[PDB]
Design a protein around this ligand. Structure first.
Ligand SMILES: Nc1ncnc2c1ncn2[C@@H]1O[C@H](COP(=O)(O)OP(=O)(O)OP(=O)(O)O)[C@@H](O)[C@H]1O
Ligand SMILES: [Mg+2]
Ligand SMILES: [Mg+2]
Length: 459
C-alpha cells in the first residue's frame, strides 16, 4: 500500500486462516504487509496467491522470491524456496484475515453502505464529516467487492475511531459475505436504481441482493432506509429487526427549499436534531439526496448537526464523478467513471443547469441484461424531450437511442465509434461561433469516454 500499516505475526495468520505451514517452516520476522501483486512483493511482505479468471498468482511466486519476499499464503504446496501457509482457498482466507483484523479493533465505529448509485459520493461526504473528529478509514477507490473489502480492512489501526466501508453488489450473496466480514454498527441502502440489471435480472433481484446488508448489523445497531424509493416497503421488512432512521420526504432527515446551482446546491436541512442551512458543493438534486443519507448516517453515529454541516460544506467529489473542468471559454463535465440509466438521467439534469450551448456526449451502458437495447431506446426518448441543444451517442446501442428520439430525432447524433464522433464535436464548436459550450461526457467503464474528452480538449 502507501499508508502505515500494523504488522502481522505468523501465529496471527495461522490462527486467522486456520491453515498450516508447509514443512513447518515458520517466518522468524513479522509480516509488515499482505499484498496480492507479485510486482511489489518485497522483503518483509507476505504474498497472497489468488486464483482468478484470467490469472493464477501461484505462477508468480518465483518472482516474489527473487524480489526478497520470504512468506506466501497459497492453496497448495509449491516447489519454490519460500515459507508457505497452506489454506483451503486463498480467496476466502483473505476475507478471514480481514474479519480477524476487524475483530481485533473493538474501539471502532463502523458504517456499511450500499446502493445502485451514489455509494462513493456518500462515502466521501461521510469521510469528510468524520475525519474532522477522529482518524477515519474509508474505502479507497473501487475496492468494494468480495476481494476489496477485506483488503481495505487490512489497513485498520488502533488510532482509527470510525470506518466507512462501501459495499458493492456485483452478484447475489456478495453483500451478505462482505457485510458479515465488516460487522457494521450502522448500515443501509442509498437507493434501488438500474445498475447491474443483467446480473440480477430485474430491480427485484437488486433489492433482494442489497437487503443482505441488514442481516449482520451488530446489536444496538441502526438500520438506514430510504423513505422515497420504489422498494421502501420491502426494505422496511428487511430491516424490521433493527432501529431505523430514514432519509427523504416524510422521513427523519429531509431537505426543503432546494436551490439548484450550476456547480452546487443550497437547501434547508431538516433533522430530528434540528434544522440548518446547507451550502453543498455538489451539483444535482441526487447529491442532495445523497447528502441527506450521509446526514442520517452521521446522526446514527451520534455526530452533532454542526459538525455534519461543517463536514458537508467542505467535502470533495471523486474522480470521474461530475468533475467540472474549465477550458476557456468552454465547460467540460467529467462524468466518465461509470454509467447507468438513472445516473445518465441525473447527469442530464445537472447539464441543464449550465450556461451556453448544452451538449451531452454519452457512450454505451454496460451490465444491462436483455433490456439493454430497450433501455438505450427509452434513454434516447427522455434525453431528447429535455431542453438539451445536442445529444451525441457513441457505441453499439447509439442507433437504438436515435430511434428512441423519435420526434426529436434531429437533436440526437449517433456514432458507432469515438474516432468518427471526434471530428463532429470539433466542428460542432466552430459551428456555433464564439459562444460558450457545455459538454458533459459520460459512459460505462469499458467505453472510456475520457479518452474522447481528452482528444477533444486537446484539439
Ligand atoms: N442518487 C444518485 N442518483 C443518480 N445518480 C447518481 C446518484 N449518485 C451519484 N450518481 C451518479 O453516479 C455516478 C457515480 O457515483 P458513485 O461513483 O458515487 O457510485 P458508486 O455508486 O460508487 O459505483 P460502484 O458500483 O462501482 O461502486 C456519478 O456520475 C453521479 O452523477
Ligand atoms: Mg455497481
Ligand atoms: Mg464505488
Amino acid at each position: 500500500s502507501t499508508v502505515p500499516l500494523e504488522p502481522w505475526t505468523a501465529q496471527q495468520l495461522q490462527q486467522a486462516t486456520q491453515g498450516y505451514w508447509h514443512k513447518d517452516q515458520i517466518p522468524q520476522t513479522e509480516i509488515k504487509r499482505i499484498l496480492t501483486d507479485s510486482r511489489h512483493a518485497e522483503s518483509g511482505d507476505a504474498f497472497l496467491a489468488l486464483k482468478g479468471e484470467r490469472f493464477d498468482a501461484h505462477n508468480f511466486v518465483a518472482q516474489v522470491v527473487a524480489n526478497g519476499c520470504q512468506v506466501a499464503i497459497v492453496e497448495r504446496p509449491i516447489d519454490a524456496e519460500i515459507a508457505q501457509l497452506v489454506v483451503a482457498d486463498t480467496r476466502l482466507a483473505l476475507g478471514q484475515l480481514g474479519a480477524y483484523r476487524r475483530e481485533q479493533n473493538a474501539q471502532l465505529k463502523v458504517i456499511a453502505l450500499t446502493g445502485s448509485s451514489g455509494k462513493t459520493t456518500t462515502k466521501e461526504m461521510l469521510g469528510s464529516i468524520l475525519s474532522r473528529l477522529a482518524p477515519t478509514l474509508i474505502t479507497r477507490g473501487n475496492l468494494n467487492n468480495d476481494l476489496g473489502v477485506p483488503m481495505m480492512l487490512l489497513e485498520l489501526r488502533k488510532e482509527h475511531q470510525y470506518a466507512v466501508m462501501e459495499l458493492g453488489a456485483n452478484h447475489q450473496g456478495e453483500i451478505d459475505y462482505t457485510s458479515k466480514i465488516v460487522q457494521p454498527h450502522v448500515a443501509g441502502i442509498l437507493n434501488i436504481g438500474t445498475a447491474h440489471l443483467g446480473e440480477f435480472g430485474g430491480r427485484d433481484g437488486i433489492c433482494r441482493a442489497k437487503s443482505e446488508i441488514y442481516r449482520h448489523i451488530l446489536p444496538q445497531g441502526v438500520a438506514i432506509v430510504p423513505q422515497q424509493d420504489d422498494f421502501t416497503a420491502e426494505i422496511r421488512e428487511a430491516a424490521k429487526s433493527h432501529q431505523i432512521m430514514s432519509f427523504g420526504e416524510g422521513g427523519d432527515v429531509f431537505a426543503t427549499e432546494i436551490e439548484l446551482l450550476p456547480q452546487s446546491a443550497n437547501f434547508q436541512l431538516h433533522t430530528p436534531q434540528g434544522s440548518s442551512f446547507v451550502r453543498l458543493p455538489f451539483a444535482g438534486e441526487h447529491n442532495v439526496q445523497n447528502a441527506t443519507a450521509a446526514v442520517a448516517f452521521a446522526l446514527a453515529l451520534g455526530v452533532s448537526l454542526e459538525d455534519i454541516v461543517k463536514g458537508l460544506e467542505q467535502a470533495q467529489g471523486a474522480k470521474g464523478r461530475l468533475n467540472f473542468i474549465q477550458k476557456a471559454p468552454h465547460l467540460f463535465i467529467d462524468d466518465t467513471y461509470n454509467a447507468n440509466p438513472t445516473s445518465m438521467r441525473a447527469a442530464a439534469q445537472v447539464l441543464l443547469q449550465q450556461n451556453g450551448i448544452k451538449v451531452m456526449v454519452m457512450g454505451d451502458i454496460g451490465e444491462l441484461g436483455d433490456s439493454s437495447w430497450q433501455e438505450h431506446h427509452d434513454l434516447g426518448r427522455d434525453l431528447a424531450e429535455l431542453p438539451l441543444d445536442h445529444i451525441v451517442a457513441v457505441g453499439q446501442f447509439a442507433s437504438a437511442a436515435l430511434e428512441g428520439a423519435g420526434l426529436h430525432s434531429t437533436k440526437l447524433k449517433a456514432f458507432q465509434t469515438q474516432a468518427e464522433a471526434l471530428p463532429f464535436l470539433i466542428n460542432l464548436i466552430q459551428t456555433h461561433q464564439p459562444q460558450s459550450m457545455s459538454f458533459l461526457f459520460k459512459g460505462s467503464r469499458f467505453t472510456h469516454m475520457e479518452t474522447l474528452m481528452a482528444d477533444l480538449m486537446e484539439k
